[PDB]
Scaffold this motif. Structure first.
Motif, PDB file in Angstrom:
ATOM      1  N   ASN A 279     -32.654 -33.068  45.168  1.00  0.00           N
ATOM      2  CA  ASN A 279     -33.512 -33.576  46.233  1.00  0.00           C
ATOM      3  C   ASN A 279     -33.601 -35.097  46.246  1.00  0.00           C
ATOM      4  N   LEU A 280     -32.591 -35.791  45.715  1.00  0.00           N
ATOM      5  CA  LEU A 280     -32.584 -37.249  45.764  1.00  0.00           C
ATOM      6  C   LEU A 280     -32.491 -37.781  47.187  1.00  0.00           C
ATOM      7  N   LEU A 281     -32.028 -36.961  48.134  1.00  0.00           N
ATOM      8  CA  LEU A 281     -31.797 -37.393  49.507  1.00  0.00           C
ATOM      9  C   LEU A 281     -33.060 -37.893  50.200  1.00  0.00           C
TER      10      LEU A 281
ATOM     11  N   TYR B 142     -25.830 -27.796  50.947  1.00  0.00           N
ATOM     12  CA  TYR B 142     -25.554 -28.573  49.750  1.00  0.00           C
ATOM     13  C   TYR B 142     -25.434 -30.056  50.095  1.00  0.00           C
ATOM     14  N   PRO B 143     -25.989 -30.940  49.270  1.00  0.00           N
ATOM     15  CA  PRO B 143     -25.936 -32.383  49.551  1.00  0.00           C
ATOM     16  C   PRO B 143     -24.727 -33.111  48.979  1.00  0.00           C
ATOM     17  N   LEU B 144     -23.685 -32.397  48.546  1.00  0.00           N
ATOM     18  CA  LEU B 144     -22.570 -33.057  47.874  1.00  0.00           C
ATOM     19  C   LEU B 144     -21.875 -34.068  48.776  1.00  0.00           C
ATOM     20  N   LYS B 145     -21.512 -33.668  49.996  1.00  0.00           N
ATOM     21  CA  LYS B 145     -20.746 -34.559  50.865  1.00  0.00           C
ATOM     22  C   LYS B 145     -21.500 -35.862  51.112  1.00  0.00           C
ATOM     23  N   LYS B 146     -22.811 -35.766  51.346  1.00  0.00           N
ATOM     24  CA  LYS B 146     -23.619 -36.969  51.495  1.00  0.00           C
ATOM     25  C   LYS B 146     -23.635 -37.801  50.218  1.00  0.00           C
ATOM     26  N   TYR B 147     -23.801 -37.147  49.068  1.00  0.00           N
ATOM     27  CA  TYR B 147     -23.818 -37.867  47.802  1.00  0.00           C
ATOM     28  C   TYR B 147     -22.519 -38.633  47.596  1.00  0.00           C
ATOM     29  N   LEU B 148     -21.395 -38.055  48.025  1.00  0.00           N
ATOM     30  CA  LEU B 148     -20.125 -38.763  47.933  1.00  0.00           C
ATOM     31  C   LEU B 148     -20.043 -39.933  48.904  1.00  0.00           C
ATOM     32  N   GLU B 149     -20.369 -39.733  50.188  1.00  0.00           N
ATOM     33  CA  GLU B 149     -20.032 -40.808  51.121  1.00  0.00           C
ATOM     34  C   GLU B 149     -20.973 -41.983  50.903  1.00  0.00           C
ATOM     35  N   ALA B 150     -22.179 -41.706  50.394  1.00  0.00           N
ATOM     36  CA  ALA B 150     -23.089 -42.785  50.029  1.00  0.00           C
ATOM     37  C   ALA B 150     -22.502 -43.644  48.916  1.00  0.00           C
TER      38      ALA B 150
END
Ligand SMILES: [Mg+2]
Ligand SMILES: [Mg+2]
Lengths: 540, 240, 113, 120
Positions: B115-117, B156-164
């Protein structure tokens, strides 16, 4: 957007209008490569294109080769065709091309050019009647006898599409003194691929700043220790200057620069000098309080705002003309006093926070500097609770504990101030625990070559793995720019090579306080520029 | 012994290092935490070896009773020795907890932190500091639920975690319980995070390489071996 | 090696180009050694001989990848492992393709951490 | 401008000074507190002028969960530079939070504090 068309025509010149009319959407530029044979009939396509001035058109002639007969003739034609194709590339686009014209030899050579440089779409054309004059080809396409044929969609090699900067200084490739440099490019790429696929020890990796497509001779030259004669090459190299004080350029400062005009002239002259040195990015430390004037309604905030505004205006002007520009961000230096008005540190920190809160502007505030007398009297065990505030708002902090300091001072500057970047600290060799800490935490070092000049642990610092960044401190006070800063390492640290210089630049570019997006854009531009400059320099 | 015998035959050997788990309120008195960290640092001082101890771990059940802002004073010395900390600040952990973990404990890695987003400044500082985020695709997928679960909306928040630009690392947690090793843990992302490309998988491997608490020279050797092997694999990858 | 053969008179009968090669009239033209891609032939294993076939069963196996070569900044400079640059461009754009379920073999062969 | 215009005509003018309220923002990206403190410090540092910022105020979410016994460490800089402090607490709070507010933040003013009568 330009749909440039490239073609080659032999005995038949009808094919180019057929290619133009094959796609009804219409192209923008058409170029045809042909030899100096007399069988050509340029007049028909000439007046056909003169019927539409709005579409550009050009004709290039391969002088001296009536037709391909022997090996020398074919190699000459291939080199000239590659040169013409690469000189007519779009700056930022892949072209179209039709292979139908010409005999099999130039068709194959053109398709090889496509396979080496890439194209948006290669295609063919088929004529059932093989027309010869415009009206009948028009009737054939109106009826439906026109046939256009397509296979290719290729990206090509970016690296070998990227060598067009070397085309000048050839006079036009006269056969008497012609050097097939495109053949040099092809032997380069084949050599790298074969060496990579025919070995394992050499096939490890090597270049971390990213490249690996230079000729093996170029890589060997990079591996050799650098000399004092590489001045032109390093000057052509883009650089980063993470430690440069604004007030020490035209050596000045508190007594002279209180007025606005002097600040404007200093800003503009500093930017001009930075661009002259091919520096692509820099971080500037400035003292707004040392520059304010309450008598003339000149607050420190006003001084900082004026600095930011003039920097933004200058970089915007440089970018709008599509010329190389130097992005620069400011660092608010928390000047050390420790004698009176100790609230000045808090005032500086609040000013820096509010300055970064501006948000808008390509030039902004990214970090603060804990400079001043780095002695024990002003170590990092004093204001950490106040630095909690600046760290809360996500602001980087740069420390400076490099002169007359003991290892524990560096240690809790790292672990209480949490300096994401560190300054100087030349005597880090004698503290192996501090070596392990700085290397594991990946915090950089702002070591200044000329500043200490006025055995250098730089080489050992690179061997250990510290992200060491070469910085100029004050070019005006030292009298030497960043280029001299990397130059003096030839005799300051014997055995130093150009690969280490590239790694130094890479360490500098990761060490700067920048956003991930801006960091990766800077990496892309830097990689492009280093590849181009080494390609240019290796030949000359 | 296993690593040495595997290397002596010049085969593929998986170099392994340990992690000392210092659980919170897992067996009773909290002096077990100090016992664990003292054991870890004394094991580190072995000096010579191949399979070493790199750092300690801080794991808990949910929160509060297992918060990450309780044992800084204990952690001062063990951090000072030269180890590393991977706080399990995540899995419905409040943002102040992760902030304390990264900043008071100087933890170089985070567990889950799904939930870091919703903490933009926490993102900004984590990305600016290149702090690794270990996360288990199958484990978090089972225990929390992400699209395509039936009767679920969260993804899942992976894709966001990567592009950030977060230094994300894909892991396995408990192979036996989850019933999934690293291979399917990487494969599951295709239907877990749609639009993910193989290139991002390569970057994930690169980040996992970067975030390991290992020496510099071993890092260069590891990068060289990985790059050569990866080039070879991709050369005979397009065959099929 | 891919090359070309050129004849000045374009002979039709065996004695004619035999004499031409005796003189040396036929020249040899090549653009150099072409490595291709080091491994693409498993298509010939997955696809059988198919001696009985027609226009119905076309295989556009690579052509879709060819179309998606550039039809599709973040994915441009995200390059790790600098030797990945020497990788032929077709495999590079293949890497640029989105992940799928059927890449289990490559995932297993992928050295992981 | 308003007060200058009123004074130039020699009429009755109401002198006005600002108060930068440091809203609690229970979680609310709590770095906003430091942002507000920095903004107030630099606004006071602007200096020249007849209308001026004179202090800061903390309020909002008066319940005990957001009492004044949390941010006692941040208020060092704003107090050292020369600003003034005001703390709103006491409408329904314990009779100890006022003591912290007056003796940790050194607040010169107390918002409400209607229940002071039960703490001699
Ligand atoms: Mg300096
Ligand atoms: Mg776990």
């Amino acid at each position: 957007m330009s749909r440039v068309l490239l073609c080659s025509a032999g005995h038949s010149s009808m094919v180019v209008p057929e290619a133009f009319h094959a796609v009804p959407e219409g192209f923008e530029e058409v170029h045809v490569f042909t030899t100096d044979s007399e069988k050509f009939n340029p007049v028909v396509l000439n007046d056909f294109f003169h019927s539409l001035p709005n579409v550009r058109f050009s004709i290039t002639k391969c002088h001296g080769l009536a037709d391909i007969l022997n090996e020398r003739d074919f190699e000459f034609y291939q080199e000239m065709l590659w040169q013409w194709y690469l000189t007519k590339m779009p700056d930022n686009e892949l072209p179209y091309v039709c292979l139908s014209g010409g005999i099999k030899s130039m068709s194959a050579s053109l398709q090889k050019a496509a396979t080496l440089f890439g194209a948006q779409s290669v295609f063919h054309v088929l004529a059932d009647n093989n027309p010869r004059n415009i009206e009948e080809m028009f009737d054939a396409l109106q009826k439906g006898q026109i046939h256009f044929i397509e296979m290719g969609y290729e990206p090509g090699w970016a690296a070998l599409r990227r060598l067009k900067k070397i085309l000048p200084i050839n006079e036009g490739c006269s056969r008497d003194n012609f050097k097939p440099l495109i053949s040099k490019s092809i032997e380069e790429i084949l050599s790298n691929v074969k060496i990579m696929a025919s070995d394992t020890g050499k096939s490890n990796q090597l270049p971390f700043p990213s490249l690996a497509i230079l000729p093996p001779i170029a890589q060997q030259w990079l591996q050799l220790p650098l000399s004092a004669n590489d001045g032109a090459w390093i000057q052509n190299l883009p650089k980063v200057d993470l430690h440069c004080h604004l007030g020490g350029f035209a050596t000045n400062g508190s007594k002279l620069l209180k007025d606005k005009g002097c600040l404007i002239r200093q800003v503009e002259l500093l930017y001009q000098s930075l661009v002259n040195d091919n520096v692509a990015y820099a971080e500037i430390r400035c003292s707004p309080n040392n520059y304010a004037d309450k008598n003339k309604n000149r607050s420190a905030w006003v001084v900082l705002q004026d600095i930011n505004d003039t920097f933004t205006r200058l970089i915007t002007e440089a970018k709008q003309k599509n010329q190389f520009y130097c992005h620069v961000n400011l660092l608010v230096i928390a000047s050390r006093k420790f004698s009176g008005d100790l609230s000045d540190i808090s005032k500086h920190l609040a000013l820096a926070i509010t300055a970064m809160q501006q948000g808008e502007g390509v030039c902004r505030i990214v970090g603060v500097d804990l400079a001043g007398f780095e002695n024990k009297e002003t170590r990092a065990s004093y204001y950490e609770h106040d630095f909690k505030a600046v760290h809360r708002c996500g602001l980087a902090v740069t420390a400076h504990a490099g002169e007359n300091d003991d290892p524990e001072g560096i240690w809790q500057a790292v672990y209480s101030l949490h300096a994401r970047r560190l300054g100087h600290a030349l005597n880090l060799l004698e503290a192996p625990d501090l070596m392990r800490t700085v290397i594991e935490r990946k915090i950089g070092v702002e070591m200044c070559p000329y500043a200490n000049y006025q055995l250098y642990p730089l080489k050992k610092y690179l061997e250990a793995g510290i992200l060491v960044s070469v910085n100029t401190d004050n070019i005006g006070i030292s009298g030497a720019n960043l280029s001299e800063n990397l130059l003096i390492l030839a005799d300051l640290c014997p055995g130093i090579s150009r690969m280490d210089v590239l790694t130094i630049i890479r360490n500098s570019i990761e060490t700067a306080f920048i956003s991930h997006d801006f960091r990766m854009e800077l990496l892309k531009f830097f990689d492009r520029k280093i590849y181009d400059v080494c390609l240019i320099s290796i030949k000359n | 012994r296993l690593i040495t015998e595997a290397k002596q035959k010049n085969q593929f050997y998986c170099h392994v290092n340990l992690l000392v788990i210092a659980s919170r309120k897992f067996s009773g008195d909290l002096s077990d935490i100090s016992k664990h960290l003292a054991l870890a640092i004394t094991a580190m001082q072995q000096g010579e070896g191949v399979c070493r101890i790199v750092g300690v771990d801080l794991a808990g059940f949910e929160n509060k009773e297992t918060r990450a802002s309780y044992y800084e004073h204990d952690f001062k010395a063990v951090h000072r020795c030269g180890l590393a900390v991977t706080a399990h600040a995540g899995e419905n952990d409040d943002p102040e907890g992760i902030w304390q973990a990264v900043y008071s404990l100087h933890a170089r890695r985070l567990g889950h932190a799904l939930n870091l987003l919703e903490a933009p400044d926490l993102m900004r500082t984590v990305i600016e500091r290149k702090i690794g985020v270990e996360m288990c695709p199958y484990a978090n997928y089972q225990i929390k639920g992400f699209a395509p679960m039936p009767n679920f909306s969260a993804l899942y928040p992976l894709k966001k975690y990567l592009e950030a630009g977060i230094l994300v690392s894909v892991n396995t947690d408990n192979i036996g319980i989850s019933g999934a090793n690293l291979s399917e843990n990487l494969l599951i992302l295709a239907d877990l995070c749609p639009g993910i490309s193989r290139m991002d998988v390569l970057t994930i491997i690169r980040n996992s390489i970067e975030t390991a608490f290992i020496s510099h020279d071993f890092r260069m050797e590891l990068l060289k071996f990985f790059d050569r092997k990866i080039y070879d694999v991709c050369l005979i990858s397009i065959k099929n």
